[model samples]
Target: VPPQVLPFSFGESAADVGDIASANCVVPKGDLPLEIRWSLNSAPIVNGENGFTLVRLNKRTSLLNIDSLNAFHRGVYKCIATNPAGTSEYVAELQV
Candidate 1:
């Protein structure tokens, strides 16, 4: 089956500089072994890159963590879920 990611938002609506932030990508129904990825402003985000961390909590969920927010961190964050069948994505804005 194709992966389907539900709509999601950041843990907080906005954050201040030097504050931590996070968001989750959840696939309520999909094929096993979904591949979840994070991106900012349409650019792919790498784990541990610029204080960002990506964690796959399980096959159906993934977490994007930001250790410290900065002006550069203010942008749209995208959670993309992919499977052999298809792909799904959710996006939210982060105000730093």
Candidate 2:
């Protein structure tokens, strides 16, 4: 079955410049070998891109970490999950 991404949070209400922020993407139930991807403002986010880190916590979870926040970091962040069956996505906002 395709992975269904759930709504996620950054664990805080808001952040400020130079503050560290992280978001989680979780698929509670899904097929094996699920793939998770992230984007900001509709632009694909790559690991180490602009000091952002992407980590696969496990088969069903992924993490996006920001070392230090900045004005550029204020935008809509999206988590995308995909499998052979289909794809799903969830989004959260980053206010800096």
Candidate 3:
């Protein structure tokens, strides 16, 4: 089956200054290796940009972490989960 992501399930809408916040993309899968990617505010989330870091919990779970949360981190985030089955995306807004 294709990936199915939880809608608007991204955690932490509001945060205190310089806090760590994260969002997750859930894709239920089997042996097939899955690829995960993320974008923020229509732009790709890169290393150290606004303290953004990508973490993979497992083949089916991926995370986008903000090391030092700030106002610049607030925006819409798109989690793109892909595998041999298909591709799925979950979009959510983050506020800081």
Each model's TM-score?
Answer: 0.92, 0.92, 0.79
| lDDT tens digits, residue span 38-77, model 1 | 9899998998788889988888988888888898789999
Give the range where candidate 2 is weakest over 10 consecutive residues by summed lDDT: 5-14
Candidate 3 is scored at a TM of 0.79
Local accuracy of candidate 2 as per-residue lDDT tens digits, 23-87: 99999877877888899999999998887999998889999999999888888999998888889
User: Candidate 3, residues 3-89: lDDT per residue as tens digits?
Assistant: 777665555567776888877787775336777788888888876575788878778888778778788888788988777888888
lDDT, candidate 3, residue 44?
Answer: 86
lDDT of 1: 0.88
Question: In order, what lDDT does every prediction score?
Answer: 0.88, 0.89, 0.76
Where does candidate 1 clash, by residue pair? none
Q: How many residue pairs in model 1 have overlapping backbones?
A: 0
Best by lDDT: 2
Which parts of model 2 are misplaced by more than 4 Å?
Answer: none
- The per-prediction tally of clashing pairs is 0, 0, 0
Which is the better candidate, 1 or 2, if ranked by lDDT? 2
What order do candidates take by TM-score, descending?
1, 2, 3
